[PDB]
């Protein structure tokens, strides 16, 4: 069901910790995402989300 491991191109090995790989892959490009207005001035966000 998991399918091929993207790192090797073949069917995923039994025992591979896919959860940690997925979490790290999702979290690594986080710094490139647009983030909240860190300075607390202005009206509360959510409308200009």
């Amino acid at each position: 069901c998991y399918g091929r491991s993207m790192a090797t191109g073949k069917l995923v090995d039994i025992g591979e910790a896919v959860g940690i790989v997925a979490a790290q892959s999702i979290g690594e490009p986080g710094t490139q995402l647009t983030m909240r207005t860190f300075h607390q001035g202005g009206v509360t966000g959510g409308a200009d989300i």
Partner: protein, 143 residues
Amino acid sequence: RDYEDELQSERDYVAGLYARLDAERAQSQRRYAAALREHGGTAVERDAEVRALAKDIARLNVADNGLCFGRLDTLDDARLYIGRLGIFDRDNDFEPLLLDWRAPMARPFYVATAANPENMRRRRQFHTLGRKVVDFTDEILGR
């Protein structure tokens, strides 16, 4: 006969404002997506523009329904439209096509009355159904 002929003219112009607003929204949406996908600037320099564009897109969405409240004119025969947002023609020295009702010169729309006309001749009001104006009513000012 005059009434629907005037109404058709009003429907035409108001349709013009919607067309101009739609062109503006597409312009902002294109740049909003472009900035998200690539900006080339520093992180704060990048997301700072996105907030402004998102603010502009939200501004347009709030306004595209019942955009024009009604026509108005001055005793000098110059005609003004009052609406949710101010729209100006870049190609004609920024002739005001639509004036935000909060604008200083738009105040006579609410303040003007027959017993004390603020240099405005005939106020008008618009009924709307989604975008199109259904019908209007007039109100004379002054003698």
